Structure 1
Amino acid sequence: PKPQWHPPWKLYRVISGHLGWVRCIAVEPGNQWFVTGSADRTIKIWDLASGKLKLSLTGHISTVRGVIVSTRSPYLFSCGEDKQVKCWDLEYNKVIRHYHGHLSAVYGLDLHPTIDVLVTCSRDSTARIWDVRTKASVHTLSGHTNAVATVRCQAAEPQIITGSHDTTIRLWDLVAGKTRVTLTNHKKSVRAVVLHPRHYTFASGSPDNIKQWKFPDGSFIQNLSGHNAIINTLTVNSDGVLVSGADNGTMHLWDWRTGYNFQRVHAAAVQPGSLDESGIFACAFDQSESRLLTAEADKTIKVYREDDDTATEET
């Protein structure tokens, strides 16, 4: 019945100036600074508090495909097209340590909320689990026929998952040095993954359809449908809305507990004359969900806020 009065989401600010398409995005836990991985081979750091930037990081051999912010230490985990995934120490204005064992480019990375480990989605299809602070590794995650698109993990029951290009979303149980289950729900390769604040159901998406699965035991949740396009990313916020970024430039906001999405957002972020098909590669919800960082292939990061209006239509 579309309950809980889904509020409309609108724009906040526009940002540009990057030398290449923005592959990844991340934010500080205290909303002090922001960072984005880009196609320009240099790790981008943008402080968005006033609309400003943060710092220009260099030394990545290729475009950074992912980054993470460690809660315990000021070390941002780095992952890029150079197959070298290196957590960076920012305390000295220089890196922490460079992880090894990835046979090909790392498509993703993640950090465990409790134990210290490094997760990676490696285009070799290998999802790297690493005991990290010791310079150690942990275990290698295999079984995906194609490359791993995404990676997610949690300190709860062995929820581990790696989105795979093979159309079967992978589920790993890491605790035993093992796996969890094979998810056949997605009919095509799933390029989207999300973790809802409800924490009950793991979220995922694919260009064919979006697959939400209620876990731990192998249960599912719901099949999100109605957005047909290549799905670049899926991000679930605390208000109950999950924005879905696409390579075509259509970001569809999601009402979830209502069973269907909260918006269909079609907007043109296109930069100056070079445009082509470039869409929004990634997006991030803020801590208070007052704005949404928009990272697009046009090298434009646009935060999104709302005008505080009544609206609340239905269909």
Structure 2
Amino acid sequence: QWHPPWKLYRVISGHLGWVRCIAVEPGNQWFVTGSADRTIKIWDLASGKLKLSLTGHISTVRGVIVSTRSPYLFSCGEDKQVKCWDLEYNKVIRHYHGHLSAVYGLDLHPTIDVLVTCSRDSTARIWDVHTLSGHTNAVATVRCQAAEPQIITGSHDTTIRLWGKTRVTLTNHKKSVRAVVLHPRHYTFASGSPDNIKQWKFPDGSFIQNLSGHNAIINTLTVNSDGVLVSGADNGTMHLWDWRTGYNFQRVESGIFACAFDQSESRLLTAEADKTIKVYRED
């Protein structure tokens, strides 16, 4: 196979701190970011220009997602808070209390109206818009699914857990896992580590292959339907891979905290520690 390499096309500034999270709204008209400057910002995707900015977290913003079935935006931050924003009204409308520590990330179930959070308190929690216990350290990322097992978490205990109980726990990683990605066809997924990015088959989590080579602190993993997998790390390096073969076909304060494709999958957006969002397309 063959993927054209990606190039830098835009740099969007405006935050005043590390950009930790990024998400694209389902209509592909705007995207939303969160930063250590404690603000949530919404930008038009075509112009890159700032549309709106929301405040309400008192700590770093670590997770964002725009609902696929609502007019709502959800967010979780290091202040242990998890909020429901109505940007049509541009304000918080609900709180989700229950985590005992900083909340690192979230994902939405495709059609059950549930929100899933992952926190430093080593648990994931489900929220109607349960408590998933068993991990022995911070859960850095969580992915939600349609079929069983619907919940996938990556923890600082180096383990993957397929879930209000765990079905599968996979211990193959030698370092703590910090990023997990689902493949849009939902038969395979991948887990990020400093030692290796590992590929697993749903639903029981069967190890497929090791994707070696990205020797850094992997903060983010994202893939599009064409099979282009993206890994961003705290040193600012980014490794592009072919999903099926596992080939690393391109290698491009500094650091990458979140990456996100747009709905067209022709744009790749990065949340970086230099306080900017960088947009890449294919050359």
Normalised by the length of structure 2, the TM-score is 0.95
Instruction: Measure the CA separation in 1 of the matches of 2:218 and 2:23.
Output: 19
Residue 160 of structure 2 is aligned with which of 163, 169, 172? 169
Please list, as runs of the form range in 1=range in 2, the aligned pairs for 1:82-97 lying within 5 A after superposition: 82-97=79-94
Shift of 1:75: 0.8
Which of 4-13 and 25-34 deviates more? 4-13
Contact preservation (8 Å) 1:159, 1:215? no
Contact preservation (8 Å) 2:41, 2:54? yes
Contact preservation (8 Å) 2:54, 2:90? no
Contact preservation (8 Å) 2:221, 2:231? yes
Shift of 1:67: 0.8
Shift of 1:298: 0.6
Other-structure match for 2:179: 192
SS at match of 2:10: coil
Shift of 1:89: 1.5
Q: Deviations over 1:157-177 (max 9, x none)?
A: 2142111001112221xxxx3
Contact preservation (8 Å) 1:75, 1:95? no
Which of 44-53 and 140-149 deviates more? 44-53
Contact preservation (8 Å) 1:241, 1:261? no
Residue correspondences, number: 282
> Residue 242 in 1 paired to residue 229 in 2?
yes
Shift of 1:91: 2.3
Shift of 1:222: 1.7
Shift of 1:17: 2.4
Contact preservation (8 Å) 1:201, 1:220? no
Q: Deviations over 1:46-82 (max 9, x none)?
A: 2221121221101111111101111111110110011
Pair 222,251 (structure 1): closer, same or farther in 2 beyond 3 Å: same
Q: Deviations over 1:249-277 (max 9, x none)?
A: 1000111212322322xxxxxxxxxxxx5
Instruction: Measure the CA separation in 2 of the matches of 1:130 and 1:263.
Output: 39
> Residue 221 in 1 paired to residue 208 in 2?
yes
Instruction: Measure the CA separation in 1 of the matches of 2:274 and 2:147.
Output: 38
SS at match of 2:17: coil
Other-structure match for 1:41: 38
Shift of 1:94: 1.5
Pair 286,71 (structure 1): closer, same or farther in 2 beyond 3 Å: same
Other-structure match for 1:272: none
Instruction: Measure the CA separation in 1 of the matches of 2:210 and 2:278.
Output: 29
Q: Deviations over 1:74-124 (max 9, x none)?
A: 110110011010111222222231111111110111110010111011101
Shift of 1:26: 0.8
Pair 51,28 (structure 1): closer, same or farther in 2 beyond 3 Å: same
Contact preservation (8 Å) 1:255, 1:263? no
Contact preservation (8 Å) 1:41, 1:63? yes
Give the alignment's Cα RMSD to 1 decimal: 2.1
Shift of 1:238: 1.4
Contact preservation (8 Å) 1:241, 1:262? no
Shift of 1:221: 2.2
Instruction: Measure the CA separation in 2 of the matches of 1:259 and 1:218.
Output: 18
Pair 71,198 (structure 1): closer, same or farther in 2 beyond 3 Å: closer
Contact preservation (8 Å) 2:168, 2:204? no
Q: Which runs of 5+ in 1 are unaligned?
A: 132-137, 265-276, 306-313
Instruction: Measure the CA separation in 2 of the matches of 1:19 and 1:304.
Output: 22
SS at match of 2:140: coil
Q: Deviations over 1:155-213 (max 9, x none)?
A: 112142111001112221xxxx3221111111110111111123111221111111211
Which of 16-25 and 195-204 deviates more? 195-204
> Residue 99 in 1 paired to residue 75 in 2?
no
User: Percent identity at matched positions?
Assistant: 100
Shift of 1:139: 0.8
Other-structure match for 1:15: 12
> Residue 293 in 1 paired to residue 269 in 2?
yes
Please list, as runs of the form range in 1=range in 2, the aligned pairs for 1:272-291 lying within 5 A after superposition: 277-291=253-267
Pair 125,285 (structure 1): closer, same or farther in 2 beyond 3 Å: same
Q: Which has the higher strand share?
A: 2
Contact preservation (8 Å) 2:38, 2:59? yes
Contact preservation (8 Å) 1:235, 1:242? yes
Q: Which runs of 5+ in 2 are unaligned?
A: none
Pair 97,120 (structure 1): closer, same or farther in 2 beyond 3 Å: same
Contact preservation (8 Å) 1:206, 1:230? yes
Instruction: Measure the CA separation in 1 of the matches of 2:127 and 2:42.
Output: 25
Residue 115 of structure 2 is aligned with which of 114, 118, 132? 118
Contact preservation (8 Å) 2:122, 2:138? yes
Which of 254-263 and 101-110 deviates more? 254-263
Shift of 1:217: 2.5
